[PDB]
Amino acid sequence: SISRFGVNTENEDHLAKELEDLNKWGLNIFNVAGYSHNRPLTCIMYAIFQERDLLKTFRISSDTFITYMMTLEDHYHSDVAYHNSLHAADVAQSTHVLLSTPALDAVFTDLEILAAIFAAAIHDVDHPGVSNQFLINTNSELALMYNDESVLENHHLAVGFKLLQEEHCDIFMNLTKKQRQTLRKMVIDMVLATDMSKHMSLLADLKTMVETKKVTSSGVLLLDNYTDRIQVLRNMVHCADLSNPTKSLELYRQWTDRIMEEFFQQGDKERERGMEISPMCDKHTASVEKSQVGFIDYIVHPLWETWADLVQPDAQDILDTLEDNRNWYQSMIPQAPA
């Protein structure tokens, strides 16, 4: 309820204004955090579940849901500049919008929809603000536990599911044993897919599927087998995760400031511990503009272009914004003549 959020009517009214964009790409999650005592993930997730009647469908009481979500959100580190609950909220809301794209209407079951949004919400939980390689190079206990493979991603999953065991936190209590098994499988698949080292193989396989792309009498995509549906969900969450550059510049710029702050903080930690600094972690040798252009050209654009193709023409506006932002940064690159 509104009381669990500690929000008064004045801020509840502001929040109502902001939530008018719940199903839109233009929602401003920064404003949402500001009116919800900085609990953007729980607030947006509650709004999303209400909007999709997921609480009613899976018999999750508001009590259990809010208790779990508030617990999960508290396990995101508010001192980590980018990988915090604000980023998770953004990704969950972005996934929520992508799931409603015309080209995918009626394609996914409710359990698959539940799985993708949940995956998005927990995908970076308890992130330390440093990369897998940093954990590996410092002989971190986490790296040793997971044998240097998708260290953080494996940890995000373990924490997300482990927290269901705390008091009044099992939001999957009323799902059948079969549903829980299937949801777990799907969630694990999608979160492990957020590991950037799997990006290329994801894109490749994604393009391939687009070659075999099948539609209907209306333009709606056809995916009758699990394997094909999970590949789309997997890529959908990956796209939402990498959606910053496709948002209105006012938002994209705030995300970029955060990702750069987090990179510099890791650079500070490397210096503090006598380790050699990482690329783009050196606040004195990193070029924000150039980095963003490179990130879009080599990773984000190639990804969204393929997604745009799969859901043609649903994502066209997203691709255009992406391109405008890319050119804005391109022209923003500093210049020193003679």
284 is catalytic: no
> Counting contacts by CB under 5 A, is residue 124 touching Zn ion?
yes
CA-to-CA dists, residue 211 to 101, 207, 225, 306, 319, angstroms:
20, 6, 17, 10, 20
Distance from C-alpha of 318 to C-alpha of 338, rounded to nearest angstrom: 39
Q: Which CB atom, from 241 or from 270, has the smaller least distance to Zn ion?
A: 241
Quick one: tokens of 16? 């109502």
Q: Which CB atom, from 87 or from 96, has the smaller least distance to ligand AMP?
A: 87
Q: Which residues contact 30 (CB under 8 A, 6 or more apart)?
A: 86, 251, 254
Task: Give the torsion through C-alpha atoms of 113, 115, 117, 119, to 10 deg.
Answer: -160
Q: Which CB atom, from 58 or from 295, has the smaller least distance to Zn ion?
A: 295
Catalytic residue among 14, 75, 77, 83: 83
Count other C-beta atoms under 10 Å from residue 138's C-beta.
Answer: 15
By the 8 A CB rule, do 244 and 25 touch? no
295 is in an annotated binding site: yes
CB of 301 to ligand AMP, least distance (A): 12
Identified binder of Zn ion from the candidate list 90, 126, 241, 270, rule CB under 5 A: 241
Identified binder of ligand AMP from the candidate list 95, 150, 244, 266, rule CB under 6 A: 244
Distance from C-alpha of 133 to C-alpha of 285, rounded to nearest angstrom: 20
Identified binder of ligand AMP from the candidate list 19, 69, 192, 259, rule CB under 6 A: 259
CB of 311 to ligand AMP, least distance (A): 22
Count other C-beta atoms under 10 Å from residue 83's C-beta.
Answer: 23
238 is in an annotated binding site: no
CA-to-CA dists, residue 288 to 5, 103, 115, 137, angstroms:
36, 35, 35, 26
Residue 256 binds which entry of Zn ion, ligand AMP, none, CB below 5-8 Å type-dependent: ligand AMP
Q: Which residue has the tokens 């809301």?
A: 93
Residue 246 binds which entry of Zn ion, ligand AMP, none, CB below 5-8 Å type-dependent: none
Q: Which CB atom, from 112 or from 241, has the smaller least distance to ligand AMP?
A: 241
Identified binder of ligand AMP from the candidate list 65, 68, 146, 295, rule CB under 6 A: 295
Distance from C-alpha of 46 to C-alpha of 44, rounded to nearest angstrom: 5
> Counting contacts by CB under 6 A, is residue 241 touching ligand AMP?
yes
List interacting residues with Zn ion (CB under 5 A). 124, 194, 241
List interacting residues with ligand AMP (CB under 6 A). 83, 87, 124, 194, 196, 241, 244-245, 255-256, 259, 291-292, 295
List the catalytic residues.
83
